[PDB]
Amino acid sequence: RINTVRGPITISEAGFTLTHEHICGSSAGFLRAWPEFFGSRAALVEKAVRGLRRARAAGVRTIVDVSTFDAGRDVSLLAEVSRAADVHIVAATGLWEDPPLSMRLRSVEELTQFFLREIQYGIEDTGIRAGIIKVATQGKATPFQELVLRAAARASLATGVPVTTHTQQAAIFESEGLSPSRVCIGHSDDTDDLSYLTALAARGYLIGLDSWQTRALLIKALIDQGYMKQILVSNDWLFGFSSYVTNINPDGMAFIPLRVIPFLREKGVPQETLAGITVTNPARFLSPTL
Ligand SMILES: [Zn+2]
């Protein structure tokens, strides 16, 4: 069973899953400070529900929202849009690029307990539990970033909930006893080299990407190398979405099933492989595994 914002779900209920999406983010809060310009909360919820119902109509069944407490996560909003659009949503714990003072001073043991609190107890006073750990990294490795990755690895070891991060790191995860099949390492264009992707893929890590046709061909290259079981999919292939710039692109959150899947079909990626990367791989990733 996977923790969603409306409660636990079985593996088989997850279906077609996007694994690194952005409903919540930095900018939604300013609707509280300035609704005259940005619109009401109800209008934001309405825009989000409409976009998710279109993604649902195109075939998306589950999305993983990777916003964290320090990057604008709003799990009560996620639960409302999940119910209205009939799309499962997995919430994340973790930390973003530049966390507050009060978090930058914590030990690995303390940060582990923070992540575990949001996985085992709930987020804030909502009772909604996170189903993934997101660790956003800036650039140059720093001791605090290594500390956060270690805390995430330990929370994953305790609960079996997967970790998703950005580009070394693999030695830290293995340092802590965590199987690579619990970790998705996301790569940007500056780290897109197919050689690096296959290297991490051969060691058991899941691979994410954060033009879109050239990203899709990188995916095909990875498949052609035999690594289809290590691939996760996300609307991030179109554009580097984040808490800075959320998913709410004339295809909206339906971009993957309406544009990328037909294109991969045109390039000859077979049906069983496409079902593997959109259904089997994310279900195996999200399913808590010790
Ligand atoms: Zn993303």
PDB file of C-alpha atoms and ligand atoms in Angstrom:
ATOM      1  CA  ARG A   1       0.000   0.000   0.000  1.00  0.00           C
ATOM      2  CA  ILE A   2       1.056   3.537  -0.997  1.00  0.00           C
ATOM      3  CA  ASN A   3       0.246   6.594   1.133  1.00  0.00           C
ATOM      4  CA  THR A   4      -1.793   9.130  -0.871  1.00  0.00           C
ATOM      5  CA  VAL A   5      -3.338  12.409   0.217  1.00  0.00           C
ATOM      6  CA  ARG A   6      -6.692  10.593   0.496  1.00  0.00           C
ATOM      7  CA  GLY A   7      -5.292   7.545   2.339  1.00  0.00           C
ATOM      8  CA  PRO A   8      -3.614   4.247   1.442  1.00  0.00           C
ATOM      9  CA  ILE A   9      -3.992   2.611  -1.978  1.00  0.00           C
ATOM     10  CA  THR A  10      -2.933  -0.781  -3.335  1.00  0.00           C
ATOM     11  CA  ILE A  11      -0.134  -1.068  -5.895  1.00  0.00           C
ATOM     12  CA  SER A  12      -2.546  -2.036  -8.667  1.00  0.00           C
ATOM     13  CA  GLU A  13      -4.699   1.060  -8.089  1.00  0.00           C
ATOM     14  CA  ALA A  14      -1.822   3.432  -8.940  1.00  0.00           C
ATOM     15  CA  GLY A  15      -1.935   2.766 -12.704  1.00  0.00           C
ATOM     16  CA  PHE A  16      -0.315   5.290 -15.051  1.00  0.00           C
ATOM     17  CA  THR A  17       1.887   7.415 -12.752  1.00  0.00           C
ATOM     18  CA  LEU A  18       3.910  10.597 -13.142  1.00  0.00           C
ATOM     19  CA  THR A  19       6.608  10.632 -10.471  1.00  0.00           C
ATOM     20  CA  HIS A  20       7.963  14.167 -10.086  1.00  0.00           C
ATOM     21  CA  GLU A  21       5.142  16.685 -10.550  1.00  0.00           C
ATOM     22  CA  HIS A  22       4.393  20.142  -9.196  1.00  0.00           C
ATOM     23  CA  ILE A  23       0.883  21.146  -8.199  1.00  0.00           C
ATOM     24  CA  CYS A  24       2.021  23.149  -5.132  1.00  0.00           C
ATOM     25  CA  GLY A  25       4.898  25.613  -5.207  1.00  0.00           C
ATOM     26  CA  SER A  26       6.381  28.967  -4.211  1.00  0.00           C
ATOM     27  CA  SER A  27       3.817  31.195  -5.872  1.00  0.00           C
ATOM     28  CA  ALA A  28       0.418  29.830  -4.757  1.00  0.00           C
ATOM     29  CA  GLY A  29       0.786  31.401  -1.307  1.00  0.00           C
ATOM     30  CA  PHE A  30       0.650  34.911  -2.740  1.00  0.00           C
ATOM     31  CA  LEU A  31      -3.027  34.300  -3.491  1.00  0.00           C
ATOM     32  CA  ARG A  32      -3.418  34.727   0.265  1.00  0.00           C
ATOM     33  CA  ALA A  33      -1.439  37.976   0.218  1.00  0.00           C
ATOM     34  CA  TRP A  34      -2.805  39.327  -3.083  1.00  0.00           C
ATOM     35  CA  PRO A  35      -5.975  37.593  -4.308  1.00  0.00           C
ATOM     36  CA  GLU A  36      -7.031  40.748  -6.220  1.00  0.00           C
ATOM     37  CA  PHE A  37      -4.232  39.994  -8.669  1.00  0.00           C
ATOM     38  CA  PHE A  38      -3.816  36.196  -8.445  1.00  0.00           C
ATOM     39  CA  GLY A  39      -7.412  35.125  -7.794  1.00  0.00           C
ATOM     40  CA  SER A  40      -9.068  33.346  -4.940  1.00  0.00           C
ATOM     41  CA  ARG A  41      -8.129  29.983  -3.498  1.00  0.00           C
ATOM     42  CA  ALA A  42     -11.301  28.585  -5.078  1.00  0.00           C
ATOM     43  CA  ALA A  43     -10.184  29.812  -8.508  1.00  0.00           C
ATOM     44  CA  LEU A  44      -6.759  28.182  -8.066  1.00  0.00           C
ATOM     45  CA  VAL A  45      -8.399  24.908  -7.007  1.00  0.00           C
ATOM     46  CA  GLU A  46     -10.721  25.151 -10.011  1.00  0.00           C
ATOM     47  CA  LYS A  47      -7.816  25.677 -12.409  1.00  0.00           C
ATOM     48  CA  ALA A  48      -5.914  22.750 -10.862  1.00  0.00           C
ATOM     49  CA  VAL A  49      -8.936  20.424 -10.922  1.00  0.00           C
ATOM     50  CA  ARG A  50      -9.632  21.206 -14.594  1.00  0.00           C
ATOM     51  CA  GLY A  51      -6.031  20.467 -15.568  1.00  0.00           C
ATOM     52  CA  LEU A  52      -5.977  17.216 -13.612  1.00  0.00           C
ATOM     53  CA  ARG A  53      -9.318  16.028 -15.027  1.00  0.00           C
ATOM     54  CA  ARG A  54      -7.852  16.502 -18.499  1.00  0.00           C
ATOM     55  CA  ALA A  55      -4.773  14.507 -17.496  1.00  0.00           C
ATOM     56  CA  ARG A  56      -7.115  11.879 -16.029  1.00  0.00           C
ATOM     57  CA  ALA A  57      -9.149  11.786 -19.249  1.00  0.00           C
ATOM     58  CA  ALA A  58      -5.938  11.248 -21.230  1.00  0.00           C
ATOM     59  CA  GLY A  59      -5.062   8.294 -18.972  1.00  0.00           C
ATOM     60  CA  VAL A  60      -3.047   9.598 -15.962  1.00  0.00           C
ATOM     61  CA  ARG A  61      -4.184   7.857 -12.767  1.00  0.00           C
ATOM     62  CA  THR A  62      -1.616   8.954 -10.141  1.00  0.00           C
ATOM     63  CA  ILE A  63       0.790  11.868  -9.762  1.00  0.00           C
ATOM     64  CA  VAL A  64       3.546  12.310  -7.174  1.00  0.00           C
ATOM     65  CA  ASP A  65       3.728  15.926  -6.017  1.00  0.00           C
ATOM     66  CA  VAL A  66       7.261  16.519  -4.735  1.00  0.00           C
ATOM     67  CA  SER A  67       6.741  19.882  -3.001  1.00  0.00           C
ATOM     68  CA  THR A  68       8.025  19.985   0.574  1.00  0.00           C
ATOM     69  CA  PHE A  69       7.059  22.048   3.620  1.00  0.00           C
ATOM     70  CA  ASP A  70       9.700  24.686   2.849  1.00  0.00           C
ATOM     71  CA  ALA A  71       8.729  24.888  -0.833  1.00  0.00           C
ATOM     72  CA  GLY A  72       5.014  25.606  -0.571  1.00  0.00           C
ATOM     73  CA  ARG A  73       3.490  22.155  -0.055  1.00  0.00           C
ATOM     74  CA  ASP A  74      -0.229  22.411   0.800  1.00  0.00           C
ATOM     75  CA  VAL A  75      -1.536  18.911   1.394  1.00  0.00           C
ATOM     76  CA  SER A  76      -5.061  20.069   2.225  1.00  0.00           C
ATOM     77  CA  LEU A  77      -5.175  21.643  -1.235  1.00  0.00           C
ATOM     78  CA  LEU A  78      -3.726  18.477  -2.753  1.00  0.00           C
ATOM     79  CA  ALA A  79      -6.426  16.384  -1.067  1.00  0.00           C
ATOM     80  CA  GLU A  80      -9.210  18.670  -2.316  1.00  0.00           C
ATOM     81  CA  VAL A  81      -7.979  18.612  -5.917  1.00  0.00           C
ATOM     82  CA  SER A  82      -7.335  14.852  -5.718  1.00  0.00           C
ATOM     83  CA  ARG A  83     -10.958  14.174  -4.792  1.00  0.00           C
ATOM     84  CA  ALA A  84     -12.442  16.596  -7.330  1.00  0.00           C
ATOM     85  CA  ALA A  85     -10.334  15.318 -10.238  1.00  0.00           C
ATOM     86  CA  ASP A  86     -10.358  11.611  -9.238  1.00  0.00           C
ATOM     87  CA  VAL A  87      -6.569  11.375  -9.525  1.00  0.00           C
ATOM     88  CA  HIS A  88      -4.447   9.867  -6.756  1.00  0.00           C
ATOM     89  CA  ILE A  89      -1.783  12.224  -5.427  1.00  0.00           C
ATOM     90  CA  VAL A  90       1.251  11.171  -3.394  1.00  0.00           C
ATOM     91  CA  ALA A  91       2.695  13.896  -1.150  1.00  0.00           C
ATOM     92  CA  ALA A  92       6.365  14.265  -0.287  1.00  0.00           C
ATOM     93  CA  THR A  93       8.422  14.995   2.770  1.00  0.00           C
ATOM     94  CA  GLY A  94      11.986  16.193   2.381  1.00  0.00           C
ATOM     95  CA  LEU A  95      13.608  19.577   1.896  1.00  0.00           C
ATOM     96  CA  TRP A  96      14.212  21.963  -0.979  1.00  0.00           C
ATOM     97  CA  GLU A  97      17.294  23.930  -2.024  1.00  0.00           C
ATOM     98  CA  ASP A  98      17.522  26.612   0.691  1.00  0.00           C
ATOM     99  CA  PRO A  99      15.831  25.493   3.927  1.00  0.00           C
ATOM    100  CA  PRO A 100      15.335  27.752   6.955  1.00  0.00           C
ATOM    101  CA  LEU A 101      17.988  28.321   9.617  1.00  0.00           C
ATOM    102  CA  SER A 102      16.073  26.057  11.941  1.00  0.00           C
ATOM    103  CA  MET A 103      16.600  23.071   9.622  1.00  0.00           C
ATOM    104  CA  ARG A 104      20.169  23.834   8.505  1.00  0.00           C
ATOM    105  CA  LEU A 105      21.282  23.425  12.152  1.00  0.00           C
ATOM    106  CA  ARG A 106      19.867  19.915  12.633  1.00  0.00           C
ATOM    107  CA  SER A 107      21.803  16.646  12.827  1.00  0.00           C
ATOM    108  CA  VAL A 108      21.252  13.654  10.548  1.00  0.00           C
ATOM    109  CA  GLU A 109      19.444  11.940  13.425  1.00  0.00           C
ATOM    110  CA  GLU A 110      17.145  14.925  13.933  1.00  0.00           C
ATOM    111  CA  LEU A 111      16.362  15.341  10.221  1.00  0.00           C
ATOM    112  CA  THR A 112      15.660  11.625   9.976  1.00  0.00           C
ATOM    113  CA  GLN A 113      13.008  12.039  12.655  1.00  0.00           C
ATOM    114  CA  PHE A 114      11.474  14.980  10.783  1.00  0.00           C
ATOM    115  CA  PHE A 115      11.072  12.901   7.612  1.00  0.00           C
ATOM    116  CA  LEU A 116       9.768   9.945   9.622  1.00  0.00           C
ATOM    117  CA  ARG A 117       7.237  12.167  11.375  1.00  0.00           C
ATOM    118  CA  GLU A 118       5.757  13.206   8.009  1.00  0.00           C
ATOM    119  CA  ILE A 119       5.745   9.556   6.778  1.00  0.00           C
ATOM    120  CA  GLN A 120       4.540   7.750   9.929  1.00  0.00           C
ATOM    121  CA  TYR A 121       2.532  10.373  11.858  1.00  0.00           C
ATOM    122  CA  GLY A 122       1.306  12.927   9.346  1.00  0.00           C
ATOM    123  CA  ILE A 123       1.918  16.287   7.752  1.00  0.00           C
ATOM    124  CA  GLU A 124       1.243  19.199  10.143  1.00  0.00           C
ATOM    125  CA  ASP A 125      -2.092  18.496  11.903  1.00  0.00           C
ATOM    126  CA  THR A 126      -3.779  16.963   8.836  1.00  0.00           C
ATOM    127  CA  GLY A 127      -3.104  13.273   9.403  1.00  0.00           C
ATOM    128  CA  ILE A 128      -2.005  12.974   5.752  1.00  0.00           C
ATOM    129  CA  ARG A 129       1.178  10.936   5.382  1.00  0.00           C
ATOM    130  CA  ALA A 130       3.927  11.387   2.822  1.00  0.00           C
ATOM    131  CA  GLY A 131       4.683   8.638   0.331  1.00  0.00           C
ATOM    132  CA  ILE A 132       8.045   9.810  -1.001  1.00  0.00           C
ATOM    133  CA  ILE A 133      11.130  11.717   0.217  1.00  0.00           C
ATOM    134  CA  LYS A 134      12.328  14.541  -2.013  1.00  0.00           C
ATOM    135  CA  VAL A 135      15.826  15.979  -1.637  1.00  0.00           C
ATOM    136  CA  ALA A 136      16.555  18.957  -3.871  1.00  0.00           C
ATOM    137  CA  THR A 137      20.248  19.666  -4.446  1.00  0.00           C
ATOM    138  CA  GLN A 138      21.777  22.942  -5.620  1.00  0.00           C
ATOM    139  CA  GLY A 139      25.095  22.219  -7.310  1.00  0.00           C
ATOM    140  CA  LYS A 140      28.381  21.759  -5.474  1.00  0.00           C
ATOM    141  CA  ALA A 141      28.127  19.014  -2.861  1.00  0.00           C
ATOM    142  CA  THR A 142      28.084  20.466   0.646  1.00  0.00           C
ATOM    143  CA  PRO A 143      28.250  18.772   4.065  1.00  0.00           C
ATOM    144  CA  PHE A 144      24.649  19.812   4.799  1.00  0.00           C
ATOM    145  CA  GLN A 145      23.399  18.356   1.520  1.00  0.00           C
ATOM    146  CA  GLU A 146      25.230  15.115   2.284  1.00  0.00           C
ATOM    147  CA  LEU A 147      23.622  15.198   5.728  1.00  0.00           C
ATOM    148  CA  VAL A 148      20.159  15.605   4.190  1.00  0.00           C
ATOM    149  CA  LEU A 149      20.728  12.727   1.755  1.00  0.00           C
ATOM    150  CA  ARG A 150      21.832  10.535   4.667  1.00  0.00           C
ATOM    151  CA  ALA A 151      18.750  11.411   6.694  1.00  0.00           C
ATOM    152  CA  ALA A 152      16.598  10.599   3.664  1.00  0.00           C
ATOM    153  CA  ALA A 153      18.370   7.264   3.183  1.00  0.00           C
ATOM    154  CA  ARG A 154      17.741   6.361   6.831  1.00  0.00           C
ATOM    155  CA  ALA A 155      14.094   7.359   6.701  1.00  0.00           C
ATOM    156  CA  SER A 156      13.784   5.171   3.598  1.00  0.00           C
ATOM    157  CA  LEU A 157      15.514   2.265   5.344  1.00  0.00           C
ATOM    158  CA  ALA A 158      13.098   2.544   8.284  1.00  0.00           C
ATOM    159  CA  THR A 159       9.891   2.821   6.211  1.00  0.00           C
ATOM    160  CA  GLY A 160      10.635   1.543   2.714  1.00  0.00           C
ATOM    161  CA  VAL A 161       9.331   4.822   1.200  1.00  0.00           C
ATOM    162  CA  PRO A 162      11.415   5.764  -1.889  1.00  0.00           C
ATOM    163  CA  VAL A 163      13.776   8.738  -2.260  1.00  0.00           C
ATOM    164  CA  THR A 164      13.858  11.110  -5.217  1.00  0.00           C
ATOM    165  CA  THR A 165      16.730  13.527  -5.717  1.00  0.00           C
ATOM    166  CA  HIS A 166      18.897  15.343  -8.285  1.00  0.00           C
ATOM    167  CA  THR A 167      22.557  15.009  -9.323  1.00  0.00           C
ATOM    168  CA  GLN A 168      28.794  10.581  -5.692  1.00  0.00           C
ATOM    169  CA  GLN A 169      25.335  10.494  -4.150  1.00  0.00           C
ATOM    170  CA  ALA A 170      25.153   6.756  -4.816  1.00  0.00           C
ATOM    171  CA  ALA A 171      27.994   6.079  -2.375  1.00  0.00           C
ATOM    172  CA  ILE A 172      26.109   7.918   0.393  1.00  0.00           C
ATOM    173  CA  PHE A 173      22.961   5.837  -0.125  1.00  0.00           C
ATOM    174  CA  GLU A 174      24.937   2.621  -0.162  1.00  0.00           C
ATOM    175  CA  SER A 175      26.944   3.902   2.834  1.00  0.00           C
ATOM    176  CA  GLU A 176      23.659   3.729   4.738  1.00  0.00           C
ATOM    177  CA  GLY A 177      22.604   0.293   3.505  1.00  0.00           C
ATOM    178  CA  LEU A 178      19.876   1.468   1.132  1.00  0.00           C
ATOM    179  CA  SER A 179      19.247  -0.481  -2.051  1.00  0.00           C
ATOM    180  CA  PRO A 180      19.553   1.667  -5.215  1.00  0.00           C
ATOM    181  CA  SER A 181      16.061   0.484  -6.255  1.00  0.00           C
ATOM    182  CA  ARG A 182      14.703   2.841  -3.573  1.00  0.00           C
ATOM    183  CA  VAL A 183      16.340   5.911  -5.157  1.00  0.00           C
ATOM    184  CA  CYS A 184      15.504   7.873  -8.287  1.00  0.00           C
ATOM    185  CA  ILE A 185      18.302  10.188  -9.385  1.00  0.00           C
ATOM    186  CA  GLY A 186      17.114  12.989 -11.639  1.00  0.00           C
ATOM    187  CA  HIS A 187      19.368  14.493 -14.297  1.00  0.00           C
ATOM    188  CA  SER A 188      19.221  17.920 -15.949  1.00  0.00           C
ATOM    189  CA  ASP A 189      20.635  18.861 -19.359  1.00  0.00           C
ATOM    190  CA  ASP A 190      24.015  19.725 -17.806  1.00  0.00           C
ATOM    191  CA  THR A 191      24.158  16.110 -16.518  1.00  0.00           C
ATOM    192  CA  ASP A 192      22.274  14.370 -19.374  1.00  0.00           C
ATOM    193  CA  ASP A 193      25.234  12.346 -20.683  1.00  0.00           C
ATOM    194  CA  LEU A 194      23.888   8.910 -21.628  1.00  0.00           C
ATOM    195  CA  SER A 195      27.091   7.351 -20.293  1.00  0.00           C
ATOM    196  CA  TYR A 196      26.304   8.600 -16.777  1.00  0.00           C
ATOM    197  CA  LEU A 197      22.664   7.480 -17.036  1.00  0.00           C
ATOM    198  CA  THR A 198      23.537   3.895 -17.975  1.00  0.00           C
ATOM    199  CA  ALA A 199      26.227   3.820 -15.276  1.00  0.00           C
ATOM    200  CA  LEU A 200      23.774   4.566 -12.464  1.00  0.00           C
ATOM    201  CA  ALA A 201      21.115   2.427 -14.148  1.00  0.00           C
ATOM    202  CA  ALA A 202      23.421  -0.604 -14.186  1.00  0.00           C
ATOM    203  CA  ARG A 203      23.841  -0.223 -10.416  1.00  0.00           C
ATOM    204  CA  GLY A 204      20.063  -0.396  -9.886  1.00  0.00           C
ATOM    205  CA  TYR A 205      19.063   3.259  -9.537  1.00  0.00           C
ATOM    206  CA  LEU A 206      15.939   4.691 -11.116  1.00  0.00           C
ATOM    207  CA  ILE A 207      16.612   7.478 -13.621  1.00  0.00           C
ATOM    208  CA  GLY A 208      14.600  10.645 -14.078  1.00  0.00           C
ATOM    209  CA  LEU A 209      15.055  13.650 -16.330  1.00  0.00           C
ATOM    210  CA  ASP A 210      14.286  17.097 -14.889  1.00  0.00           C
ATOM    211  CA  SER A 211      13.895  20.215 -26.233  1.00  0.00           C
ATOM    212  CA  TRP A 212      11.464  17.497 -25.139  1.00  0.00           C
ATOM    213  CA  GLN A 213      11.935  15.353 -28.260  1.00  0.00           C
ATOM    214  CA  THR A 214      15.645  15.061 -27.478  1.00  0.00           C
ATOM    215  CA  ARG A 215      14.869  14.054 -23.900  1.00  0.00           C
ATOM    216  CA  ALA A 216      12.459  11.423 -25.253  1.00  0.00           C
ATOM    217  CA  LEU A 217      15.224  10.056 -27.497  1.00  0.00           C
ATOM    218  CA  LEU A 218      17.563   9.889 -24.497  1.00  0.00           C
ATOM    219  CA  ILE A 219      14.888   7.740 -22.858  1.00  0.00           C
ATOM    220  CA  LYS A 220      14.772   5.566 -25.975  1.00  0.00           C
ATOM    221  CA  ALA A 221      18.567   5.262 -25.948  1.00  0.00           C
ATOM    222  CA  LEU A 222      18.383   4.087 -22.324  1.00  0.00           C
ATOM    223  CA  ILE A 223      15.738   1.512 -23.286  1.00  0.00           C
ATOM    224  CA  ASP A 224      17.802   0.358 -26.267  1.00  0.00           C
ATOM    225  CA  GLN A 225      20.666  -0.271 -23.824  1.00  0.00           C
ATOM    226  CA  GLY A 226      18.416  -2.659 -21.869  1.00  0.00           C
ATOM    227  CA  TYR A 227      17.554  -0.368 -18.932  1.00  0.00           C
ATOM    228  CA  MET A 228      13.793   0.062 -19.395  1.00  0.00           C
ATOM    229  CA  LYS A 229      13.126  -1.139 -15.815  1.00  0.00           C
ATOM    230  CA  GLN A 230      15.064   1.842 -14.396  1.00  0.00           C
ATOM    231  CA  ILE A 231      13.072   4.640 -16.095  1.00  0.00           C
ATOM    232  CA  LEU A 232      10.456   6.883 -14.498  1.00  0.00           C
ATOM    233  CA  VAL A 233       8.374   9.435 -16.392  1.00  0.00           C
ATOM    234  CA  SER A 234       7.349  12.990 -15.597  1.00  0.00           C
ATOM    235  CA  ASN A 235       5.989  16.110 -17.256  1.00  0.00           C
ATOM    236  CA  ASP A 236       9.432  17.532 -16.373  1.00  0.00           C
ATOM    237  CA  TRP A 237      10.537  16.244 -19.791  1.00  0.00           C
ATOM    238  CA  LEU A 238       8.829  19.261 -21.344  1.00  0.00           C
ATOM    239  CA  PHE A 239      10.248  21.926 -19.037  1.00  0.00           C
ATOM    240  CA  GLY A 240      12.087  22.033 -15.719  1.00  0.00           C
ATOM    241  CA  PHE A 241       9.073  22.396 -13.445  1.00  0.00           C
ATOM    242  CA  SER A 242       9.652  22.967  -9.739  1.00  0.00           C
ATOM    243  CA  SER A 243       8.157  24.679  -6.725  1.00  0.00           C
ATOM    244  CA  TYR A 244       9.438  27.810  -8.464  1.00  0.00           C
ATOM    245  CA  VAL A 245       7.373  26.996 -11.584  1.00  0.00           C
ATOM    246  CA  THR A 246       4.507  24.522 -11.176  1.00  0.00           C
ATOM    247  CA  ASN A 247       2.624  22.489 -13.806  1.00  0.00           C
ATOM    248  CA  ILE A 248      -0.335  24.928 -13.627  1.00  0.00           C
ATOM    249  CA  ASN A 249       2.378  23.732 -22.731  1.00  0.00           C
ATOM    250  CA  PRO A 250      -0.975  23.593 -24.549  1.00  0.00           C
ATOM    251  CA  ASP A 251      -1.158  19.973 -23.323  1.00  0.00           C
ATOM    252  CA  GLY A 252      -0.951  20.822 -19.608  1.00  0.00           C
ATOM    253  CA  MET A 253      -0.460  17.880 -17.318  1.00  0.00           C
ATOM    254  CA  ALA A 254      -1.649  15.656 -20.208  1.00  0.00           C
ATOM    255  CA  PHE A 255       1.590  16.311 -22.090  1.00  0.00           C
ATOM    256  CA  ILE A 256       3.098  12.855 -21.476  1.00  0.00           C
ATOM    257  CA  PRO A 257       0.169  10.713 -22.721  1.00  0.00           C
ATOM    258  CA  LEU A 258      -0.916  13.094 -25.503  1.00  0.00           C
ATOM    259  CA  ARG A 259       2.519  13.994 -26.928  1.00  0.00           C
ATOM    260  CA  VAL A 260       5.423  11.904 -25.619  1.00  0.00           C
ATOM    261  CA  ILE A 261       3.828   8.433 -25.726  1.00  0.00           C
ATOM    262  CA  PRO A 262       2.689   8.827 -29.390  1.00  0.00           C
ATOM    263  CA  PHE A 263       6.161  10.144 -30.314  1.00  0.00           C
ATOM    264  CA  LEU A 264       7.926   7.179 -28.668  1.00  0.00           C
ATOM    265  CA  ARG A 265       5.474   4.937 -30.526  1.00  0.00           C
ATOM    266  CA  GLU A 266       6.478   6.630 -33.797  1.00  0.00           C
ATOM    267  CA  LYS A 267      10.128   5.908 -32.958  1.00  0.00           C
ATOM    268  CA  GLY A 268       9.248   2.230 -32.463  1.00  0.00           C
ATOM    269  CA  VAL A 269       9.192   1.877 -28.668  1.00  0.00           C
ATOM    270  CA  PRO A 270       6.919  -1.158 -28.169  1.00  0.00           C
ATOM    271  CA  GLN A 271       3.725  -1.157 -26.147  1.00  0.00           C
ATOM    272  CA  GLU A 272       4.945  -3.446 -23.334  1.00  0.00           C
ATOM    273  CA  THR A 273       7.909  -1.134 -22.745  1.00  0.00           C
ATOM    274  CA  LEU A 274       5.720   1.979 -22.553  1.00  0.00           C
ATOM    275  CA  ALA A 275       3.430   0.245 -20.066  1.00  0.00           C
ATOM    276  CA  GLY A 276       6.556  -0.709 -18.127  1.00  0.00           C
ATOM    277  CA  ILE A 277       7.821   2.834 -17.707  1.00  0.00           C
ATOM    278  CA  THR A 278       4.416   4.414 -16.984  1.00  0.00           C
ATOM    279  CA  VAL A 279       2.843   1.712 -14.773  1.00  0.00           C
ATOM    280  CA  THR A 280       5.148  -1.113 -13.607  1.00  0.00           C
ATOM    281  CA  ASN A 281       8.280   0.899 -12.775  1.00  0.00           C
ATOM    282  CA  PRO A 282       6.537   3.618 -10.678  1.00  0.00           C
ATOM    283  CA  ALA A 283       4.377   1.075  -8.827  1.00  0.00           C
ATOM    284  CA  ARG A 284       7.519  -0.875  -7.901  1.00  0.00           C
ATOM    285  CA  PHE A 285       9.268   2.391  -6.943  1.00  0.00           C
ATOM    286  CA  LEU A 286       6.437   3.786  -4.784  1.00  0.00           C
ATOM    287  CA  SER A 287       5.536   0.482  -3.153  1.00  0.00           C
ATOM    288  CA  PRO A 288       7.303   0.558   0.246  1.00  0.00           C
ATOM    289  CA  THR A 289      10.020  -2.097   0.061  1.00  0.00           C
ATOM    290  CA  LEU A 290      12.471  -2.915   2.838  1.00  0.00           C
TER     291      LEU A 290
HETATM  292 ZN    ZN B   1       9.650  17.641 -11.130  1.00  0.00          ZN
END
